[PDB]
Amino acid sequence: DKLIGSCVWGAVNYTSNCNAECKRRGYKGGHCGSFLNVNCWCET
């Protein structure tokens, strides 16, 4: 997983569609972590 942003409102690197963002950039997917769903962790 790669830290590109945060899946939490208010955060500077806020991004809701983390999965799409990561997929767009060129990653396997996105899930914001399978527990610590605070950061936009790109599946990789």
Side-chain angles (χ1 to χ4, degrees):
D1 282 2
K2 284 295 186 64
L3 175 63
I4 66 166
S6 183
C7 309
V8 179
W9 57 83
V12 181
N13 285 50
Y14 174 49
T15 184
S16 46
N17 207 182
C18 180
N19 185 183
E21 180 56 50
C22 297
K23 197 66 178 182
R24 188 71 63 181
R25 298 190 183 194
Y27 291 82
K28 305 171 187 177
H31 55 178
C32 307
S34 304
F35 179 50
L36 295 81
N37 58 296
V38 290
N39 294 301
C40 175
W41 298 100
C42 295
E43 297 181 302
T44 191

